[PDB]
Amino acid sequence: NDVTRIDAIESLTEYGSKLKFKPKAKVIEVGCADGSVSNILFQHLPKDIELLLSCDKNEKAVQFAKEHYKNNKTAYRVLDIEGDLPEDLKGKFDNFISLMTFHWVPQQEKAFRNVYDLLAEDGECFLTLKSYSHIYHMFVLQSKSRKWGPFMKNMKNFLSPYYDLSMPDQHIAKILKNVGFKNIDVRSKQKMYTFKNLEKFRGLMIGVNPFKVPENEFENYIDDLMETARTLRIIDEENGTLSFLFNMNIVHCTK
Amino acid sequence: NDVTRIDAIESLTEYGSKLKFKPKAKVIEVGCADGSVSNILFQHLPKDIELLLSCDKNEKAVQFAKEHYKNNKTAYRVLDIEGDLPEDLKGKFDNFISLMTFHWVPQQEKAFRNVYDLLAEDGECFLTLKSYSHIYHMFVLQSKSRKWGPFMKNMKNFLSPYYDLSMPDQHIAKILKNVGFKNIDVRSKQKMYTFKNLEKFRGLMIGVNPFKVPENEFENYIDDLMETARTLRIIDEENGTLSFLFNMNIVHCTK
Ligand SMILES: Nc1ncnc2c1ncn2[C@@H]1O[C@H](CSCC[C@H](N)C(=O)O)[C@@H](O)[C@H]1O
C-alpha cells in the first residue's frame, strides 16, 4: 500500500499537466482496493468533476471503502474489469483511471476492450502497471525449488503479463490501437524503492503471496521466500534495508 | 554484441521516421570501430549524406578498421568523449549517433557537453545506453563473494551510472537540459534477449568482463560467473537457452 501510494503520487505529478478532464467529468477508477489511494487520487482531480466511481473485484474492500472514504462526489461498486460490463456503465465515462492494478489482469485485450466500452467519445484512459520486478523474481526463484514448485503452478497468472516480454510498451500500444484507441502514449520507467523495515516487508510478502502450501510448511515457505531476496543480494544486512527494482508502464490514450 | 546489434535494429526501426537528417549531413558515430554496426546504420542513413566519421577510444580498433574496412564515405578517428575534443571537430557535425556505448562512461555530464560541442546549430543527437541489466546484476553477485570481491573493487565505474537509479529517463533529461539541448525526448525500454547456446554467452561475459584475476584462477572466475546465471535462474537447462532482461534509455535531443 506504501509502494503503490508513492507510485500513485509519482505518476500523477509526472502526468498532471497531460491528463485533461472536461467540465463536470464522470471519472471511473478501477482497483480502488480499500480506497486510501482512491482518496489521494480524488484530491488531485479537478473540483469541477461530477462523479468519481471507484471499483474493485474485492467485495470486502469495496465495503470498507463505502464505510470510510465516501463523500457526495464518490460512489463505490463491485466490478470485474475482465468480466462483462453492466449495461448502465457502458459509454458513461469521460476519464478512466487505474493505478497499479492492470498487472493483476491476465485477459489484457478483454480488459482494454472494457475500458473502451466504458468511455464516452473523446474519453481519456490513464493506467500504470508493473512489468519486470525484483518482487516477482523472488517468487520465480521460489517456484524453481523442488519443495515449493508443486504448489506454484498458477505462476504465469500471478506474474505481470509483461514480466518476461521485450518492449511491453509496444505490445500494449498494439493491443490499444487494435481495440480502437487513439493518441496512444505508452512509456516505460525503471523505478527503485527502498524498504527500511525488514519485519514490515516479510508481512507484505505474506500479503502479496497467492500460493497455498500446507499450514505446517507455511513458516518454512516464507523463510525460503525471504532467502530469495538474499540470493538476489537486494537485502542490506547491516542497515536492515531492502531496495528493489521494478519496471512501470504508464498508458495514456483517448477514445 | 548480438545484444548491441539487435538493439541497433529495434532502436533505429522504432525511431527511423522520427530521426531527421538534412541534405549533405556530416554524421559522427561513437561506439566500436567494427563496421558491422556502421553497415546497419547505412541502411537507416540517407544516401545523399556527405561524410560518416566513426570514432572509438581504442587505438588498435581504429587502426584495424582504416586498414581493412571500406566505405569511401566513412572515416575512422580515435576519440575519447570523456576527454577534451580536438578543436577541428567542435561545431562540425549535423548528427551524432552512439548505440549502447554511454553506459561505459562514468562522467555522463562531461560526455553530453562534448556531444553538444561536436554539433553545428540545429544538430540532432541519437543515443541508446543501458541502465539495469541481469548481466550487470550477475557481476554484482560475483563482487559480493569472498574469493573475487578483492579483484572487483571498481564496480561503481563498470556498472551503468543508471544501474540502480529510480527513473533514469528524468536523470538523463536533466543533464541534457543543463548542457543546453532542446526538444529532449528520453524513453526507457524493458528489453529481453535469449542466447541459443551457452558457450556463446560464456563468450560475451569474457567479452564484457573488465576485472583482472590471476591467469591460473581465470577459468574458476568465469565458471563462478556462469553459476550466478543459475542463481538468478535465467538459464533453461532443458534447452540450453538463457533469457535475460536489460533496461535501456533512448535519447533524442536537438542542439
Ligand atoms: N479484474 C479486476 N477487476 C477489478 N479489480 C481488480 C481486478 N483484478 C484485480 N483487481 C483489484 O485491483 C487491486 C490492485 S492492488 C493496487 C491497489 C490500488 N490500485 C493502488 O494503486 O494502491 C486489488 O484490490 C485487486 O483486487
Task: List, as one string, the DSSP characters of chain B.
Answer: -HHHHHHHHHHHHHHTTT----TT-EEEEES-S-HHHHHHHHHHS-TT--EEEEEES-HHHHHHHHHH---TTEEEEE--TTSPPPTTTTT-EEEEEEES-GGG-S-HHHHHHHHHHHEEEEEEEEEEEEEEEHHHHHHHHHHTSTTTGGG---HHHHS-TTTT-S-HHHHHHHHHHHHT-EEEEEEEEEEEEEESSHHHHHHHHHHH------TTTHHHHHHHHHHHHHHTT-EETTTTEEEEEEEEEEEEEE-
Residue of B138, B134, B139, B143 whose CA lies nearest to B248: B134
- Rounded distance between C-alpha atoms, residue B12 and residue A253, angstroms: 24
* Ligand 1 centroid, distance to A143 Cα (angstroms): 24
User: Resolution of the experimental model in angstroms, please?
Assistant: 2.5
State in Å: Cα A58 to ligand 1 middle: 8
| CB A37 near ligand 1, within 6 Å | yes
A57 CA from centroid of ligand 1 (Å): 7
How many Å lie between the alpha carbon of A231 and the closest alpha carbon of chain B?
Answer: 7
Probe site for chain B from A6, A162, A190 (most B CB atoms < 10 A): A190
Cell numbers describing residue B248 = 535501456
Query: What are the φ/ψ torsions at residue A75 (nearest 5 degrees)?
Result: -140, 155
Collapse the DSSP code of A157 into the 3-class scheme (helix H, G, I; strand E, B; otherwise coil) and give the result. Answer: helix
Question: Cα angle at B250 between B249 and B255, to 5 degrees?
Answer: 125
- Whether residues A141 and B233 touch (CB distance < 8 A) is answered with yes
Taking the C-alpha atoms of residue B198 and residue A171, their distance in angstroms, rounded to an integer, is: 28
Task: Provide the shortest C-alpha distance from residue B41 to chain A (in Å).
Answer: 21
Q: Which residues of A touch B168 (CB under 8 A)?
A: 190
Residues of chain A neighbouring B238 (CB-CB closer than 8 A) = none
Atom of ligand 1 nearest to the CA of A33: 24
Q: Do A131 and B162 touch (CB under 8 A)?
A: no
Q: In DSSP terms, which residues pair with A77 in a beta bridge?
A: A55
Cβ atoms of residues B122 and A214 within 8 Å: no
CATH class of this structure's domain B2-254: alpha beta
Q: Are B100 and B3 in contact (CB under 8 A)?
A: yes
Per the entry, the structure determination technique was: X-ray
Shortest Cα distance, chain B CAs vs residue A19, angstroms: 19
Nearest Cα residue to atom 11 of ligand 1: A31
CA distance B237 to B234: 9
**Ramachandran angles phi, psi of B185, nearest 5°:** -120, 115
Which residue of chain A is at minimal alpha-carbon distance from B186? A187
Cα separation, A192 vs A241, whole angstroms:
13
Is the CB–ligand 1 distance for residue A33 below 6 Å?
Answer: yes
Nearest alpha-carbon partner for B27 in B104, B122, B118, B114: B118
- Grid cell 480502437 is found at A180
Indicate the helix (H) or strand (E) that contains A129.
strand A119-133
Give whole-number Cα distances, B205 to B135, B208, B238, in Å: 8, 5, 21
Cα separation, A8 vs A164, whole angstroms: 24
Which among B187, B253, B48 has a CA at the least distance from the CA of A169?
A: B187
A95 CA from centroid of ligand 1 (Å) = 18
